[PDB]
Design a binder for this molecule. Structure first.
Ligand SMILES: O=C(O)c1cc(C(=O)O)c2c(n1)C(=O)C(=O)c1cc(C(=O)O)[nH]c1-2
Ligand SMILES: [Ca+2]
Lengths: 573, 71
């Protein structure tokens, strides 16, 4: 959408979760900078009126902030000239049974926005846990249209944010832990008409492939693989949901995202590469047809769900300025691909303790597996890094184009894993592994790191008490801001990693910070309200260390630092 | 199984030592019920058909109506 692209370039706005179509999470605002951030104070605050995990962050467009909640996914609008009043509210009525089929807390990664055009007035888009995509009038909150994407009776929900491209809004999927076969869907913004729908497994017509799919890298695989890399009909329940983030290149007219893990977690029940789960896709915008598809983790054994964000940039590769995507996967590798051809540029370890894979062979594109850290029936596999939580999860990260550095919140969590046999029944969980998780070999649970994604050179690295889950915001003031699970927002100097400022929020953070200018002043805003996968223990009062899909034991100390909450904090000088 | 021995481009899977090429008939046979397997796709077809009713009513009347029994 060229008007949405243009609004994204205006520092008064934050028009999508990812900030802009490249997912830079980078602001040119410098009012707040490394030399005065120690003076940042809370300006004003809002309550969301809910508990549970608060993922994503607010949108700001044309002087209005938009807020969203975890289930039941209430939305409200606030005029930045009258911060105490809610301009409008939208309160979904959803079946409470939706909560029982969410694997990982009833999180929602937030709203999307499109400006007014031929399709009608400006709209806010919401994905509901119960599987509906809703279009609201951005100025009034009136419901314009609503469609069914996902059915909770099959264990299929929505948690990832909608994504607007031209006249379409894209809606993902969720429920691979209940055997949902992933799919992404484009709806027309005017009337909610389904334009196209691309599945992650199965026959080529379902995958929606360009006739020249992987023409540039035929060694990745081309046709027939969504059937031939599974035994029989096991693809029909085979995972590959896409509950993460998108990017878009308007010049190529290509949309990028990752498909998630194959189901079940029990690898022995699903022999084969299990394509095209765990895949980096480049899809034509109008048709949805994939131009490239790179499977990062063939035959996943670890739930490295391949949904993490895609950060676009233009950097020199062997001296030639090249359009790129960069993608810190769950599997602990940072992928950088040519975003036109899909060619692999690099795949480096985000922390050197990654052990499921020895290295990626860049020429073949294959990860060279270490069988010592495989999983398999009738075996308790020990000391696998990363754990299923990944060395990176759902947080959107940030890129400073002057430094050519990505700044990432990183997890340092490893695991033991033993699968088990179990039947598939639609609507029930379909996991089939028992896990124990714990800190990686360096002994803490999180890090923040700065890196060059072409060379792999780590600029700086610093430890954090807990996994850094919510992502980052970087600015031209030489700062990276992020929130922590234990309930801080913090700012570090992006040259050195030095900590410049910290503030104690009410609850842990699982979303990202934003910044915007309003009436000549810079603000930083963030949600506070712990939850998501790390918070399942505290949110659901769980005690068995293998409960919450194995996260309970690793995060057992988090409840000593934070309770649940739900608030928006806005800071300024 | 180190992931580098490929039967075909995009297809590198091997069984691990001592495990079967095919699971059907093995001790690891998932024995999925084909009727259970098909339920998701049936549910999608039903959602798609309702959505298409809502779209058609919008194009006919100019007013959006969610509940398909009210159209
Ligand atoms: O396979 C799925 O469809 C699915 C969905 C979700 C979800 O909807 O949030 C998560 C996961 N998987 C998962 O693998 C995971 O690590 C996870 C963490 C979180 C969270 O918000 O903290 N959700 C999810
Ligand atoms: Ca998963």
């Amino acid at each position: 959408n060229s008007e949405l692209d243009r609004l994204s370039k205006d520092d008064r706005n934050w028009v999508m979760q990812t900030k802009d179509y490249s997912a830079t999470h980078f602001s040119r605002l410098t009012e707040i900078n490394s030399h005065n951030v120690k003076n940042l104070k809370v300006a004003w605050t809002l309550s969301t009126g809910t508990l549970h995990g608060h993922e994503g962050a607010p949108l700001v467009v044309d002087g209005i902030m938009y807020i969203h909640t975890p289930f039941p996914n209430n939305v409200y609008a606030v005029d930045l000239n009258d911060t105490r009043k809610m301009l409008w509210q939208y309160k979904p009525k959803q079946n409470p049974a939706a909560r029982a089929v969410a694997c990982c807390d009833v999180v929602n990664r937030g709203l999307a926005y499109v400006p007014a055009g031929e399709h009608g007035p400006a709209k806010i888009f919401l994905n509901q846990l119960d599987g509906h995509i809703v279009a609201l009038n951005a100025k009034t909150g009136e419901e314009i249209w609503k469609m069914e994407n996902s059915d909770i009776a099959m264990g299929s929900t929505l948690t990832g944010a909608p994504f607007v491209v031209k006249d379409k809004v894209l809606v993902g999927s969720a429920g691979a832990e209940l055997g949902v076969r992933g799919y992404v869907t484009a709806y027309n913004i005017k009337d909610g008409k389904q334009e196209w729908r691309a599945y992650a497994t199965g026959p080529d017509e379902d995958l929606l492939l360009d006739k020249d799919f992987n023409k540039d890298n035929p060694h990745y695989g081309q046709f027939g693989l969504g059937l031939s890399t599974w035994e029989g009909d096991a693809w029909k329940i085979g995972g590959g949901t896409n509950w993460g983030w998108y990017a878009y290149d308007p010049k190529l007219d290509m949309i990028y995202y990752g498909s998630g893990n194959p189901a079940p977690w029990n690898e022995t029940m699903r022999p084969g590469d299990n394509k095209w789960t765990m895949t980096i896709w480049g899809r034509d915008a109008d048709t949805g047809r994939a131009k490239f598809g790179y499977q990062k983790t063939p035959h996943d054994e670890w739930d490295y769900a391949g949904v993490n964000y895609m950060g676009l940039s233009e950097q020199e590769v062997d001296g030639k300025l090249t359009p790129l995507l960069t993608h810190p996967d769950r599997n602990g590798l940072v992928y950088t691909l040519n975003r036109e051809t899909g060619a692999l540029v690099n795949a480096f370890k985000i922390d050197d303790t990654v052990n499921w894979v020895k290295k990626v062979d860049l020429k073949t594109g294959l990860p060279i597996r270490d069988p010592e850290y495989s999983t398999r029936m009738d075996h308790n596999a020990k000391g696998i890094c990363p754990s299923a939580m990944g060395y990176h999860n759902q947080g959107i990260e940030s890129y400073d184009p002057d430094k050519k550095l990505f700044f990432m919140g990183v997890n340092h969590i490893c695991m033991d894993w033993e699968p088990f046999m179990l039947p598939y029944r639609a609507g029930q969980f379909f996991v089939g592994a028992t896990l124990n998780m714990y800190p990686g070999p360096k002994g803490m649970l999180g890090q923040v790191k700065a890196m060059n994604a072409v060379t792999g050179k780590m600029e700086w690295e610093v430890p954090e008490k807990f996994a850094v889950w919510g992502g980052t915001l970087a600015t031209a003031g030489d700062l990276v801001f992020y929130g922590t699970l234990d309930g801080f927002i913090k700012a570090r100097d992006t040259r050195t990693g030095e900590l410049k400022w910290q503030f104690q929020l009410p609850s842990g953070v699982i979303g990202h910070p934003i910044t915007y200018q309003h009436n000549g002043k810079q603000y930083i805003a963030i949600y506070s309200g712990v939850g998501g996968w790390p918070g399942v223990g505290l949110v659901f009062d769980l005690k068995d260390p293998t409960a919450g899909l194995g996260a309970v034991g690793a995060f057992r100390e988090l409840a000593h630092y934070t309770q649940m909450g739900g608030s928006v904090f806005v800071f300024s000088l | 199984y180190d992931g580098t021995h490929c039967k075909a481009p995009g297809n590198c899977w091997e069984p691990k030592p001592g495990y079967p090429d095919k699971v059907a008939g093995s001790k690891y046979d998932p024995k999925h019920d084909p009727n259970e397997l098909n339920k998701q796709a049936e549910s999608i077809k039903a959602m798609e058909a309702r959505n298409q009713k809502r779209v058609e009513n919008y194009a006919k009347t100019g007013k959006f109506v969610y509940k398909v029994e009210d159209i």
